[PDB]
Design a protein around this ligand. Structure first.
Ligand SMILES: Nc1ncnc2c1ncn2[C@@H]1O[C@H](COP(=O)(O)OP(=O)(O)O)[C@@H](O)[C@H]1O
Ligand SMILES: Nc1ncnc2c1ncn2[C@@H]1O[C@H](COP(=O)(O)OP(=O)(O)O)[C@@H](O)[C@H]1O
Ligand SMILES: [Mg+2]
Lengths: 436, 49, 432, 48, 48, 119
């Protein structure tokens, strides 16, 4: 990521070999108990034997719940599916909320498939169907390393004729599927006409027969959506269906179970590996009572992933209810099913450390007095406001001709921009003038 | 009668979803909906085994 | 290896743990306590298995953590996979594609299984020669390892063979009644050593035995599946997409009549099943009103429901009812009450969970965890089982001790402690 | 056989073995899946 | 009798170096769809 | 605009058409879409037709008046021979709105292809 995001400095949980949390490591400062709990949760995710366990990160805003979740994702690695979703993303206009939740659940479950692919690629030097109907197709493919003669299954002749493959074209043929793609004409024939509307492609460099053993990760949702609608099809209904607008559909549980059976078959064969993964739901308080009730059942499934929730609400009304209040905006029945990780507020020293880390991540040099002033500002207003003042202050320093942030630049930026509390005070002082 | 709108885009954009065959697995091993109307229970249960 | 089915919240439950007299054992098939509730569940299970009486409703009511979903999973496990068991949550009937009543009708019809039995004569062999004179008349030669014969083709047979591109070396089966041709595979010869193969070609051995064969297919489908098949031209696609919509009532009446005709003819058998709706209190008053009369049909399954609500507000109304369910529906159903577990029952459940997760715990650890479970909740203790196992494995230990349980108790908070800590810093949180 | 080469024939027989192995693996792969419903069930359940 | 005030062909996508397989595939799809569906659209000729 | 004297397909098959009016005769080569439209209009030798080159809209107006005496019951509507030139250019003022252009370009129906009808 070339651009710097809000959590670009989080590289991990910062734990040691014993699971204890270092004071400042991997871009995380403080929150030692929460980081140790997240390390235990990571160990839970790595030990794939548990399904449907749910975790809630509860604390005041700005205490690092999203940072902790992203640190968990980094600790697991790109091999484990980490699906981040926002609670307000379940209000789709195409499918019901429970369908969105189950789709994300299946997104979190990953499948790793090891397969060797074979492709015959090269310029076509000969294309001769052998009559007995067509018994087989003899094709001649040329590369920089030689020429190869291939006997093709007669079903591939239809694909070759559809793609308009002639001598001199550069094509590839999939050994397992027979798919043919004509990727242009060979550049040796580029001068056969002075003006043709053709795409001329260099002759392939390697061998005609190319073998590669690859490991590709797919999720259960990919297989669900792959089996929701048919693909290809020369029938009139299929062709007219290709023009239909692609709409998300409520995939049946029958299809889910059949796909689970297929996945188990391939796991038993030994060509597939299961990666349970993690589903992160942020702003879970935006879910209504129906979503929470469905989560009660979904988490109890033996196929579900590990779900991590985050909430900053206090005793607030559940979204779908009239006046029912709950500790985090989450019904007590779902709170009974989750392990709660509590995040605490930061001391001024921790805030200064986080500001310094953000400055280093953004490529900004800041003096000690400027850092102390920024920490004082963060204590006065908010850590996020102080972190957001670094880049504009650096820009003012660069305009003034200085390569480092001085106290005067921080003061100028604090004068130019206001925080939430200052703006609210201004609004309260001028209630009549502002719109109601 | 008006001429149509000619929308010009980068040639690289049309290849965004394209993945080389040596870089992707065969998704036909999970094709359940493709078997309907083409494969029978006899073939799956009695003949092929 | 790690299969798709892993240790869940009810993976330790294999049945209801009853004897031949439906008397519940104290700890059998993964269930502890709930003797009266388990006996009631067994009675309901016998009622389901008999299949004589239609549209019977049972509500499993009780406090959270008292084993309602445990009992439902035990009933599902004890009932064979042959008998349908549709388990849905209350929130799943609110769909953007079909009405709530349509969702409930589809849930009802998914719970009745129809086992079909079709016997069909087929011709099966490898194609040797196809000669067609001129698309008017022709001959087809088929062979097995022990037989070979030639057939005279008509116009439609020739057209069907040309449409499917049947050639020499293909192993095909032909239905005598309908004439449809499906290709099983092609035989392997020395000249068929392809370097690349199509996505549908596969090589099979030449069939043995006799060219004429009888094909018997037995499958279990639900009424909803037949409805979706006969809803539109390619309705079987909606069995994958789910874009069924609202099926016309006339289609459903026709399919009920046709299924009765099949059952009379001996070509199909009815297997009524169970519809389990978990957290029914999420249903609206309209849904309850529909349930009132949906259970009165002769094709209605057993409706098992589970709620943990006290006297609360019915959704969509301002009225208070004992379970969130209007008393008219509650009069149509039998209520099975679950009692809270004792210390011994909690300890036995913890032992079963530890055995399921393959965790060794000391007896002092079991005592501490049982005390925690009584104080906080049973599910909190169950989660602490795995948390403490992980922490113990981290310190290169083999048996979970009291120190590990205390450590995970300090690391992970239950609802009460989290609520207290939030109340300590209430102004920090948003929208109190 | 004056022009016979051992290396060329070894390469050719290795290629033949690889081709046969590929044929076997593809034939196994293309018939592993069983239909959820199947043609017979759908035909039986499909009214006029 | 109602005629649209303006009539335009569909927007066309132009790229300097497009995938040389997209256009033939679209042309074949359109040709097949037209050959299968145009005879069925003749009754609507007077309306059009 | 004129009476059709020759409708010769030219192999996708183009059409070579001969039109005569009271002022002259002209032979034209038209696109296969125009030939399909002519077939849909059932245009045969002796029919008076109107073709708009901008939209490719072919309208058959009737069998020419000169053939109205051949039969007594033909089930045809006869139309006089056009009295101008075969090829005409007329300049007119069109009143349109921006919304009309937006609609024409958002739900196109000017291609006269199968995809437009499908959409
Ligand atoms: N303990 C911490 N160490 C380092 N950075 C932190 C810490 N806590 C919060 N941050 C940073 O502060 C910013 C806001 O925190 P955020 O994760 O949004 O908190 P919340 O999710 O509770 O709103 C984030 O960009 C995050 O990287
Ligand atoms: N009688 C029992 N035997 C074994 N485990 C039980 C029993 N009752 C409850 N449990 C366990 O307690 C957990 C919560 O109970 P459950 O029945 O799923 O929800 P609730 O009873 O709150 O509706 C489940 O994981 C279940 O395994
Ligand atoms: Mg429950």
């Amino acid at each position: 990521t070339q651009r710097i995001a809000s959590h670009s400095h989080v590289k991990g949980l910062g734990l040691d070999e014993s699971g204890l949390a270092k004071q400042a490591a991997s871009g995380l400062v403080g929150q030692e108990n929460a980081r140790e709990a997240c390390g235990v949760i990571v160990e839970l995710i790595k030990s794939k034997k548990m399904a449907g366990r749910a975790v809630l990160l509860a604390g005041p805003p700005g205490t690092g719940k999203t940072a902790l979740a992203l640190a968990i994702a980094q600790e697991l690695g790109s091999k484990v599916p980490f699906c981040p979703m926002v609670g307000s993303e379940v209000y789709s206009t195409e499918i019901k909320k429970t369908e969105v939740l189950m789709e994300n659940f299946r997104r979190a479950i990953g499948l790793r498939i090891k397969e060797t692919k074979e492709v015959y690629e090269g310029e076509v030097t000969e294309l001769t169907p052998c009559e007995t109907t067509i018994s087989h197709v003899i094709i001649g493919l040329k590369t920089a390393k030689g020429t190869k003669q291939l006997k093709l299954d007669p079903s591939i002749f239809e694909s070759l004729q559809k793609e308009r493959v002639e001598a001199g074209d550069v094509i590839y043929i999939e050994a397992n599927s027979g798919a043919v793609k004509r990727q242009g004409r060979c550049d040796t024939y580029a001068t056969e006409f002075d003006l043709e509307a053709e795409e001329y492609v260099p002759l392939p460099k390697g061998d005609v027969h190319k073998k590669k053993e690859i490991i590709q990760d797919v999720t259960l949702h990919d297989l669900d959506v792959a089996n929701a609608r048919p693909q290809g099809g020369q029938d009139i209904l299929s062709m007219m269906g290709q023009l239909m607008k692609p709409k998300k559909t409520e995939i049946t549980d029958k299809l889910r179970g059949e796909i689970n059976k297929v996945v188990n078959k391939y796991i038993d064969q030994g060509i597939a590996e299961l990666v349970p993964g993690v589903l992160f739901v942020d702003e879970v308080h935006m879910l209504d009572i129906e979503c929470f009730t469905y989560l009660h059942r979904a988490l109890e499934s033996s196929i579900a992933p590990i779900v991590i929730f985050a909430s900053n609400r206090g005793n607030c009304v559940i979204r779908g209810t009239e006046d029912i209040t709950s500790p985090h905006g989450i019904p007590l029945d779902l709170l009974d099913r989750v392990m709660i990780i509590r995040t605490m507020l930061y001391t001024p020293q921790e805030m200064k450390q986080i500001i310094k880390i953000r400055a280093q991540t953004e490529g900004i040099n800041i003096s000690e007095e400027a850092l102390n002033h920024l920490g004082e500002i963060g204590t006065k207003t908010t850590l996020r406001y102080s972190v957001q003042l670094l880049t504009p202050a650096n820009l003012l320093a660069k305009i003034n001709g200085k390569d480092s942030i001085e106290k005067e630049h921080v003061e100028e930026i604090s004068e130019l921009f206001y925080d939430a509390k200052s703006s609210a005070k201004i609004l309260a002082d001028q209630q009549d003038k502002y719109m109601k | 009668i008006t001429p149509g709108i000619c929308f010009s885009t980068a040639s690289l954009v049309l290849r965004a979803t394209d993945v080389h065959p040596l870089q992707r697995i065969d998704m036909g091993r999970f094709d359940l909906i493709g078997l309907e109307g083409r494969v029978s229970r006899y073939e799956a249960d009695t003949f092929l085994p | 290896v790690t299969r798709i089915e892993r240790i869940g919240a009810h993976s330790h439950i294999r049945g209801l743990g009853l004897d031949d007299a439906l008397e519940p054992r104290q700890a059998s098939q993964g269930m502890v306590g709930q003797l009266a509730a388990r006996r009631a569940a067994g009675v309901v299970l016998e009622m389901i298995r008999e299949g004589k009486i239609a549209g019977r409703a049972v509500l499993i009511a009780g406090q959270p953590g008292t084993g309602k979903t445990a009992i439902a999973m035990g009933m599902a496990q004890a009932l064979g996979p042959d008998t349908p068991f549709t388990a849905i949550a209350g929130s799943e009937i609110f769909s953007l594609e079909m009405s709530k009543t349509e969702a409930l009708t589809q849930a009802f019809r998914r719970s009745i299984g129809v086992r079909i039995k079709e016997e069909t004569e087929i011709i099966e062999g490898e194609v040797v020669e196809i000669q067609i004179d001129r698309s008017k008349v022709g001959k087809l030669t088929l062979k097995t390892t022990e037989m070979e014969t030639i057939y005279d083709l008509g116009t439609k047979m020739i057209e069907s063979l040309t449409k499917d591109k049947v050639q020499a070396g293909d192993v095909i089966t032909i239905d005598k009644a309908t004439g449809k041709i499906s290709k099983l595979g092609r035989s392997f010869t020395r000249a068929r050593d392809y370097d690349a193969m199509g996505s549908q070609t596969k090589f099979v051995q030449c069939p043995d035995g006799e060219l004429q064969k009888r094909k018997e297919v037995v499958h279990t489908v639900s009424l909803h599946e037949i409805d979706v098949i006969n809803s539109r031209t390619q309705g079987f696609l909606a069995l994958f997409s789910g874009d069924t919509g609202e099926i016309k009532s006339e289609v459903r009446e026709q399919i009920n009549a046709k299924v009765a005709e099949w059952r009379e003819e001996g070509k199909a058998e009815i297997i009524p099943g169970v519809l389990f709706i978990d957290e029914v209190h999420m249903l609206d008053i309209e849904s309850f009103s529909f349930l009132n009369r949906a259970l009165e049909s002769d094709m209605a399954p057993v409706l098992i429901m589970a709620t943990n609500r006290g006297i609360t507000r019915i959704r969509g109304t301002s009225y208070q009812s004992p379970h969130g369910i209007p008393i008219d529906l509650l009069d149509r159903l039998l209520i099975v009450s679950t009692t809270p577990y004792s210390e011994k029952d909690t300890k036995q459940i913890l032992r079963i969970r530890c055995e399921e997760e393959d965790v060794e715990m000391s007896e002092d650890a079991y005592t501490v965890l049982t005390r925690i479970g009584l104080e906080t909740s049973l599910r909190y203790a169950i989660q602490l089982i795995t948390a403490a196992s992980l922490v113990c494995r981290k310190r290169k230990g083999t048996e979970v001790q009291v120190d590990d349980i205390k450590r995970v108790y300090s690391l992970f908070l239950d609802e009460s402690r989290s609520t207290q800590y939030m109340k300590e810093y209430q102004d920090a949180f948003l929208f109190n | 056989s004056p022009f016979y080469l051992d290396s060329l024939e070894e390469k050719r027989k290795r290629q033949r073995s690889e081709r046969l192995e590929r044929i076997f693996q593809l034939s196994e792969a293309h018939g592993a899946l069983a239909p959820v419903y199947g043609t017979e069930v759908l035909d039986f359940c499909t009214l006029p | 009798f109602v005629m649209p005030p303006v009539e335009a062909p569909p927007p066309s996508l132009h790229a300097c170096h497009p995938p040389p397989w997209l256009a033939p595939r679209q042309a074949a799809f359109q040709e097949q769809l037209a050959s299968e569906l145009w005879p069925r659209a003749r009754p609507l000729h007077r309306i059009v």
